[PDB]
Amino acid sequence: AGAVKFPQLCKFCDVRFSTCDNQKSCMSNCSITSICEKPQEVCVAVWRKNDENITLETVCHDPKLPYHDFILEDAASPKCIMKEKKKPGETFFMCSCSSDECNDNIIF
Amino acid sequence: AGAVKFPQLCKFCDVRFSTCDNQKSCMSNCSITSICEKPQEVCVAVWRKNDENITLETVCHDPKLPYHDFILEDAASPKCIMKEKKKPGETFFMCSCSSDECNDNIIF
Amino acid sequence: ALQCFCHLCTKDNFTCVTDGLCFVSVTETTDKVIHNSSCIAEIDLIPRDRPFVCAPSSKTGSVTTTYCCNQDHCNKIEL
Amino acid sequence: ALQCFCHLCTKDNFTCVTDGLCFVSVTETTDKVIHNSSCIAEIDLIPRDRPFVCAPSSKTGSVTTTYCCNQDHCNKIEL
Amino acid sequence: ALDTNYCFRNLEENCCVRPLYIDFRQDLGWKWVHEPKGYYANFCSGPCPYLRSADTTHSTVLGLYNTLNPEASASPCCVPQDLEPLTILYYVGRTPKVEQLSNMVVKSCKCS
Amino acid sequence: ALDTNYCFRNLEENCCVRPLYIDFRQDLGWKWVHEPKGYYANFCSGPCPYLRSADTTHSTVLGLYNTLNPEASASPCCVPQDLEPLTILYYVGRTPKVEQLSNMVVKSCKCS
């Protein structure tokens, strides 16, 4: 039978300036917990730091669709474990997780 | 304030043949317990015996109105206590009482 | 149509219009009096000739005393 | 308009028509299965995007398991 | 709804309809009801866990509250869903009177 | 009906409305309700003696039955009379959504 796939709860503040710096664990400090628009969507957390300051991104996103020109492996994982991405002059980190508010606790 | 006077519960079988004979206490054996039609009405029990057989009467009746050409003293009494009435060749008894089903227990 | 005092009828200027009777009930247990005034419809009076809802404390169970009435605005108490 | 299996709908040939979803719930405590199938209206789904009534046993409290569905006559179980 | 066909068939602790016979004279003190002598009025009894025939949204909410917090002493209550009328006979004066009183017999229970 | 203006003013053992605050996250586990954090849902509690805001004719009958026979373990139950809606805010994707959910807050209790 066609059981309804129900979307998850994720932090959804998008691009926000963050104080998360040189830490093993970070809280999102995103007040917006959203029911994702689409059933297959999962939680995403993007950590970016340049020469100036730091930015943190929180979104619902489709697993098999590129975000920042990157794939989403380990999206079935219940915790958001960050992994480094190669960008020139740009410190890049991203995690994907399939649990309610899992992108609130960002683990390095 | 004009409080509604509520009628009483009495046995209401009217003229019925009875086995009540030479006894200090009698049950009416009247299956009909009626809410009297009029608020001021009270329970009445009439015991009549001639040369042949016995009859018992059970009715709701107005206190200050003659029944069998007789007055209704002691109608405010909670029990039905019978009192003899003078009739030629006719053994007559009647009681009046102001209580729920008080004319069910006829006391001589 | 009767007109009874109704303590709940705030929008109706504390009055209800019924085709039955006016009602009062008083609860008394160690220095307390609960006053309850309303209208009872004729269909809710069971039966119309002698409703059981109108049976006083001597009949019901001596917990509260009930008062039934057919006069206008009669169901209010003041000493 | 959806068409769901409705065990209560005796006059409706065990079917209900809704604008929401079909529902199932199973109670299991020591050799017993309580099957309950009905329609839920879209206003009763709170919210429409993810209704809390449809939250399974892993979310609600592990007492009973709930099943929600958008297919026709899907809310019936047979092994 | 939780009806008599389910409650009287398989008995359980949770909210359900339960049999109760009331003799008008022996239990209520009504000496005026001529017919019948008594009747099955029934009642509702039993605790209300989550989603058990919940009445409103509050019943669902308070129910869930008592699921995660059963020590809170606050839960939905077993209460009649729909009721059926009883036909009674009584005498007023001399004339017999037949009335039908609605909401006399419980047939189903809910959790409000 | 037994309302909040009477129940919260003078407290008593018998059936009445009683205060209850529910934090969506801390009590229900709802992490999706953005606004408000919690609300006074309240509940109904207390025994139902004779004529105490009786719901139906059965409530009056069963009530009287428990008056003359309080050891019968069968009585009317304290249950919400009328309820009020709660307005909630939640996010779906990026767009905030404001909904009004009816029957969330108890304001009056009856005996059914």
UniProtKB/Swiss-Prot annotation, chains A, B:
Stated consequence of mutating I32V: In a colorectal cancer sample; somatic mutation
Modification note: Phosphorylated on a Ser/Thr residue in the cytoplasmic domain.
Glycosylation sites: N29, N53
Cysteine disulfide partners in this protein: C10-C43, C13-C30, C20-C26, C36-C60, C80-C95, C97-C102
Biological function: Transmembrane serine/threonine kinase forming with the TGF-beta type I serine/threonine kinase receptor, TGFBR1, the non-promiscuous receptor for the TGF-beta cytokines TGFB1, TGFB2 and TGFB3. Transduces the TGFB1, TGFB2 and TGFB3 signal from the cell surface to the cytoplasm and thus regulates a plethora of physiological and pathological processes including cell cycle arrest in epithelial and hematopoietic cells, control of mesenchymal cell proliferation and differentiation, wound healing, extracellular matrix production, immunosuppression and carcinogenesis.
Quaternary state and interactors: Homodimer. Heterohexamer; TGFB1, TGFB2 and TGFB3 homodimeric ligands assemble a functional receptor composed of two TGFBR1 and TGFBR2 heterodimers to form a ligand-receptor heterohexamer. The respective affinity of TGFRB1 and TGFRB2 for the ligands may modulate the kinetics of assembly of the receptor and may explain the different biological activities of TGFB1, TGFB2 and TGFB3. Component of a complex composed of TSC22D1 (via N-terminus), TGFBR1 and TGFBR2; the interaction between TSC22D1 and TGFBR1 is inhibited by SMAD7 and promoted by TGFB1. Interacts with DAXX. Interacts with DYNLT4.
Family, as annotated: Belongs to the protein kinase superfamily. TKL Ser/Thr protein kinase family. TGFB receptor subfamily.
Protein name stated in the entry: TGF-beta receptor type-2
Residues of the full protein shown: 42 to 149 of 567
UniProtKB/Swiss-Prot annotation, chains C, D:
Processing after translation: Phosphorylated at basal levels in the absence of ligand. Activated upon phosphorylation by TGFBR2, mainly in the GS domain. Phosphorylation in the GS domain abrogates FKBP1A-binding. N-Glycosylated.
Effect of substituting P51L: In MSSE; hypomorphic variant
Domain of life of the source: Eukaryota
Location of the protein in the cell: Cell membrane; Cell junction, Tight junction; Cell surface; Membrane raft
Entry-listed glycosylation sites: N13
Extracellular compartment segments: 2-79
Expression sites by tissue: Found in all tissues examined, most abundant in placenta and least abundant in brain and heart. Expressed in a variety of cancer cell lines.
Disulfide pattern: C4-C22, C6-C9, C16-C39, C54-C68, C69-C74
Impact after mutating C9Y: In MSSE; hypomorphic variant
Record's subunit section: Homodimer; in the endoplasmic reticulum but also at the cell membrane. Heterohexamer; TGFB1, TGFB2 and TGFB3 homodimeric ligands assemble a functional receptor composed of two TGFBR1 and TGFBR2 heterodimers to form a ligand-receptor heterohexamer. The respective affinity of TGBRB1 and TGFBR2 for the ligands may modulate the kinetics of assembly of the receptor and may explain the different biological activities of TGFB1, TGFB2 and TGFB3.
Annotated family: Belongs to the protein kinase superfamily. TKL Ser/Thr protein kinase family. TGFB receptor subfamily.
Function statement: Transmembrane serine/threonine kinase forming with the TGF-beta type II serine/threonine kinase receptor, TGFBR2, the non-promiscuous receptor for the TGF-beta cytokines TGFB1, TGFB2 and TGFB3. Transduces the TGFB1, TGFB2 and TGFB3 signal from the cell surface to the cytoplasm and is thus regulating a plethora of physiological and pathological processes including cell cycle arrest in epithelial and hematopoietic cells, control of mesenchymal cell proliferation and differentiation, wound healing, extracellular matrix production, immunosuppression and carcinogenesis.
Protein name in UniProt: TGF-beta receptor type-1
From Swiss-Prot, chains E, F:
Protein name in UniProt: Transforming growth factor beta-3
Localization annotation: Secreted
Span within the parent record: 301 to 412 of 412
Disulfide links within the chain: C7-C16, C15-C78, C44-C109, C48-C111
Lineage, uppermost ranks: Eukaryota, Metazoa, Chordata, Craniata, Vertebrata
